[PDB]
């Protein structure tokens, strides 16, 4: 049939769950809790955290996207009762090739050309990031490293960045607590695949790398009983 | 051989002025001919002439560009069972139809005189 | 008359191979291994055709696939460095474009029973010895000419030697959706992959990327008849077919 | 618009010389440099044509035309041995045709006043030092880029440095039967000598055999003004056209 069920396009096009956070906007400084996991956040986007924990797009070798994030935020700190009075949340794509906040109150939440988004916390917002791919086509699956040369990291192979968001509060005034979850849905479209890939048999143990783990316990079944069945 | 025998021989051919291979690898770097043992037993190769200073020096001399033929195992030797022994290899030349002799000598060989006559 | 098969002189440059047994090729997509990545710049050409003086077959070393025995594994654009005038073409320029035409012979009489398995993969990233988040340094990957050589070579800091999860985590009986042949000794000796260039970027160095990894596998094991030799002899040739390269008019040299 | 001399791009491979002072141009006789030695042997050709790649135009090493300075002479198939493709194509196959183009220029001012003598002499045998009975070795010979250096660079063993003999026996003013122009200061700055290939045999190594001495010597000495430099610089490039080689699909390696 010509029916988008069993195609490609059906296939990887679903919505899920990447990068559950939680952030918060406390003061400038104030408590000493400033760095890890409060007053901003930056992904560094990859599709290898939950996509069923890398499967279906690791059954091809050659993809490209056009993704739909939708950022889902939501106040952790009792919504029903306040801790939302005008709760501004910023998002923000950086794309590949461009530097990444490391700060709250930094330069580049308002630079020049980072397309940032601004929504009501409890509220959605849609985005649609088109194919940012350095090759023609995604290298999910690359074998080789970045140079001979100097040679960039390793063969994680970032060259093929897709791009990193950021998420940020714009309040002030420390004297309460609030706190702000932050959930962004993948949703890739046109999905073009190519170089179908034998599956994996265990459960992965890095990123990038495709290395099977150790220690493994066997992945096929034995036979209840002998090659007779029933 | 025998019939069920089979083995991969790589035979290279140098030209001359160039010096011989010495090993598989290097022969395979040059001009190789495999055409198997185990299905196919006559391999011809012709062998073109080249043009050193307007021909070929007739004279007795051990210089070593005249051209080089050798023949390297690709593989070992696949034996059928308990043949326990050895195969041999039959080798021969001749001349094309494009072949030439020019000027016609003596022909000592063995610095010839014998008056014999009966 | 009689049995006619295609066992005619392919001869091509300095290689005059002509060793088909049941000549039948499959060839790894639709897709032939095809020179023009474009038609133009609407430019007058100067474009580096080494298809006159490229397309050797390149044989390799044989290898003994005896009883106990795994597999072989060939980095195949990095196989061929230290070699030939492709090699000297590969460290001469950087970029280039190579399909590939692999003819993969086993030598073996009537008497021998056993299956292999020749898969040509894409990409094949490979899984460490190590096996955790680290992998070989790029050392141990390609030794060329050698393979990894997956048959009880067992080795620390570089890949893993693990047969059924073929340096991959997939498995064994799982990885033919690849291109593949079995090479049966009832019915064949021989296997030919035809191989066309494969790379989401057009044009791309093959000191730096490795393309394709070639493994020869056996899955079922060899039982010679005894008496015999415990050993039969595997010989692949490579015949690169529509190279291109890049570097036109610019490479002046760089040793190594 | 005025002046409009020949100064055009002449780009030929990794070669854009185009410096041409009065760009007017001597051949040696009436024979162009050309390829075919024949038609054909009614056969499909698979003819060495490295024309497309040998055609650069190879420079040497600049050399400075002093006060006290007598000549110098390079063998020309000899000189580009440790250099180019042409050098590479020359130890690695044996036998080459070999026409070339020889473009010596000087660079000099308005004020400097001198005359040189480029000469193409072919077959040209040397004359010894030691002037008996025997002759140089052939190292002293072809230094290659260096040339013999006739300019007061005396030696032991091996040819002459005698200038008027010009290591023939023969004469100085009565060397012009050979092809040759004369670089005027008052006139010119460059001098173009267009050799076609020379042998009674039609194919011949390079390696062995010398085809062509080249000489560039002054006869009038230069005499610069008072308060400059008493040296002029001489640069000679060698573009070989229509050239040939024997070796196809023959020549694997050779080092030396």
């Known amino acids: 049939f010509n029916g988008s069920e069993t195609d490609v396009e059906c296939f990887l096009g679903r919505a899920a769950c990447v990068h559950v956070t939680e952030i918060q906007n406390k003061d400038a400084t104030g408590i000493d809790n400033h760095r890890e996991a409060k007053l901003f956040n930056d992904w560094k986007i990859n599709l290898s955290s939950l996509v069923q924990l890398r499967k279906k797009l690791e059954l091809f070798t050659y993809v490209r996207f056009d993704s739909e994030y939708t950022i889902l935020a939501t106040a952790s700190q009792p919504d029903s009762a306040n801790y939302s009075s005008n709760l501004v949340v910023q998002a923000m794509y950086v794309p590949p090739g461009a530097p990444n906040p490391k700060e709250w109150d930094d330069y580049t939440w308002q630079s020049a050309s980072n397309p940032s988004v601004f929504f009501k916390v409890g509220d959605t917002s849609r985005f649609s990031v088109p194919y940012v791919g350095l090759a023609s086509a995604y290298n999910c699956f690359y074998d080789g490293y970045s140079h001979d040369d100097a040679e960039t990291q390793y063969g994680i192979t970032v060259l093929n960045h897709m791009g990193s968001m950021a998420f940020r509060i714009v309040n002030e005034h420390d004297e309460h607590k609030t706190l702000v979850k932050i959930r962004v849905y993948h949703r890739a479209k046109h999905v073009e695949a190519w170089i179908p890939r034998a599956p994996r048999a265990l459960p992965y143990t890095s990123i990038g790398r495709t290395n099977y783990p150790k220690n493994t316990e066997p992945v096929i079944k034995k036979r209840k009983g002998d090659i007779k069945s029933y | 051989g025998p019939a069920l025998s089979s083995a991969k021989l790589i035979l290279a051919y140098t030209p001359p002025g160039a010096r011989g291979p010495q090993d598989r690898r290097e022969a395979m770097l040059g001009t190789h001919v495999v055409w198997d043992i185990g299905l196919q037993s006559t391999i011809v190769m012709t062998i073109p002439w080249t043009s050193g200073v307007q021909f070929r020096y007739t004279d007795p001399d051990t210089y070593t560009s005249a051209g080089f033929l050798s023949c390297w195992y690709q593989t070992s030797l696949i034996l059928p069972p308990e043949t326990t022994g050895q195969v041999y290899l039959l080798s021969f030349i001749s001349a094309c139809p494009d072949f030439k002799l020019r000027l016609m000598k003596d022909t000592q060989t063995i610095s010839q005189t014998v008056a014999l006559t009966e | ?256």
Not at chain 3, 198 to 205: G, H, L
């Open chain 3, 1 to 256: 008359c009689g049995y006619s098969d295609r066992v005619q002189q392919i001869t091509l440059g300095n290689s005059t191979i002509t060793t088909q047994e049941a000549a039948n090729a499959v060839v790894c997509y639709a897709e032939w291994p095809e020179y023009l990545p474009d038609v133009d710049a609407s430019d007058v050409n100067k474009t580096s055709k080494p298809d006159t003086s490229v397309c050797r077959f390149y044989t390799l070393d044989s290898k003994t696939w005896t009883t106990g025995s795994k597999g072989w594994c060939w980095k195949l654009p990095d196989a061929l460095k230290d070699m030939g005038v492709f090699g000297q073409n590969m460290f001469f320029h950087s970029l280039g474009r190579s399909g590939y035409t692999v003819h993969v012979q086993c030598n073996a009489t009537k008497f021998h029973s056993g299956c292999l398995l020749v898969v040509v993969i894409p990409e094949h990233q490979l899984a460490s010895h190590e096996g955790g988040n680290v992998s070989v340094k790029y050392t141990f990957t390609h030794p060329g000419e050698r393979g990894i050589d997956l048959s009880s070579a067992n080795e620390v800091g570089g890949p893993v030697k693990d047969v059924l999860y073929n340096m991959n985590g997939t498995l064994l009986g799982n990885l033919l959706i690849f291109p593949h042949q079995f090479i049966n000794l009832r019915t064949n000796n021989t296997a030919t992959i035809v191989i066309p260039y494969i790379n989401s970027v057009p044009i791309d160095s093959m000191t730096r990327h490795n393309n394709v990894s070639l493994m020869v596998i056996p899955i079922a094991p060899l039982t010679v008849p005894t008496g015999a030799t415990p050993s039969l002899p595997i010989t692949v040739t490579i015949a690169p077919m529509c190279t291109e390269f890049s570097g036109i008019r610019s490479k002046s040299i760089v040793p190594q």
